[PDB]
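PROTEIN–LIGAND DATA SHEET

This sheet pairs a single protein chain with one bound small molecule, zinc ion, given as SMILES. Inputs appear in the order they were entered. The predicted three-dimensional arrangement of chain and ligand is reported afterwards as a token string under its own label.
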Amino acid sequence: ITGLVYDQRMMLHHNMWDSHHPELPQRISRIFSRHEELRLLSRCHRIPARLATEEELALCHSSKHISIIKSSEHMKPRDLNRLGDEYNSIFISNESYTCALLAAGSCFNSAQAILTGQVRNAVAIVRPPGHHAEKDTACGFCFFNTAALTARYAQSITRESLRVLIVDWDVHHGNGTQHIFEEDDSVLYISLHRYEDGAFFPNSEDANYDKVGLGKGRGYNVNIPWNGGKMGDPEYMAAFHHLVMPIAREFAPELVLVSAGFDAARGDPLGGFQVTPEGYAHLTHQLMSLAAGRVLIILEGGYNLTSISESMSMCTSMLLGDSPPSLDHLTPLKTSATVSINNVLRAHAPFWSSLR
Ligand SMILES: O=C(NO)C1CCCCC1
Ligand SMILES: [K+]
Ligand SMILES: [K+]
Ligand SMILES: [Zn+2]
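PREDICTION REPORTED AS:
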């Protein structure tokens, strides 16, 4: 059984000044429509959405940050515009806080259904995204770090040391998710992202391969940074074969969370990459071999409505047990991609004997 959560109330979050801003309300409604259109929806068990509580938000976020975003619910447009412009790439409406609560709570229920065995796996069609949100601030269309919160929520209903793998294949680095767990060895963060030597958003060298985690978390933060332009299925398949899967198998996670941005997809207006829907299917299908299939796919970015609808639908098809579609002939890896993969291997072979 595959769970699915979608609540159109999360469309209420909108940009009052720029109705064509790429983080559109119809992102989640188009993904949902494509599931119904491919007759995938009726094959899933519907999981209800709910508001995350403030105590649940406190699992990852400061009390100050919670109260600021919470206060935006009663703000006038002038206060909303000014508050949004205080962050890096944030727009806010009076419904933003509620929708971020719904995004988190949707994933809490989905992780709860997985960990209790109600469903084998699940998909969360939610917005606003989360992986850029930090402990104490919002960033890059994200208010609260949904994936990070779900990992802590999972631990709170099982045991504190539950091994949670977070795979972040959104094209941008999840700076918030990395920082939140950087000193933690119970949550293994693996991110593939366009980096361009720090030039690509979020424009920090924190996303480079040499950031392996700190303290107890040393070795439990894996950055796979792409440099030198367009990447696609050949590069992502290789990164999974050489890095993501062997590290994940050695970590032996008890729950797998996918920060599933689809802005690395062919056709995305911001990513500039060419990962295909079949590619995302194969990536999903491989992660399903971990944690006894307990995988939760959480929507992050991705802004070509057609690309993200086909891509995420193909992921759900894999969760439902369908056989992987056929990849195109995988071209030779771009030379810069082999350099990136080798750099990560050298950085993490000390901590992961499966890489030696
Ligand atoms: O998809 C994203 N993050 O994952 C966006 C974050 C803000 C800057 C544009 C891209
Ligand atoms: K990423
Ligand atoms: K970590
Ligand atoms: Zn992104």
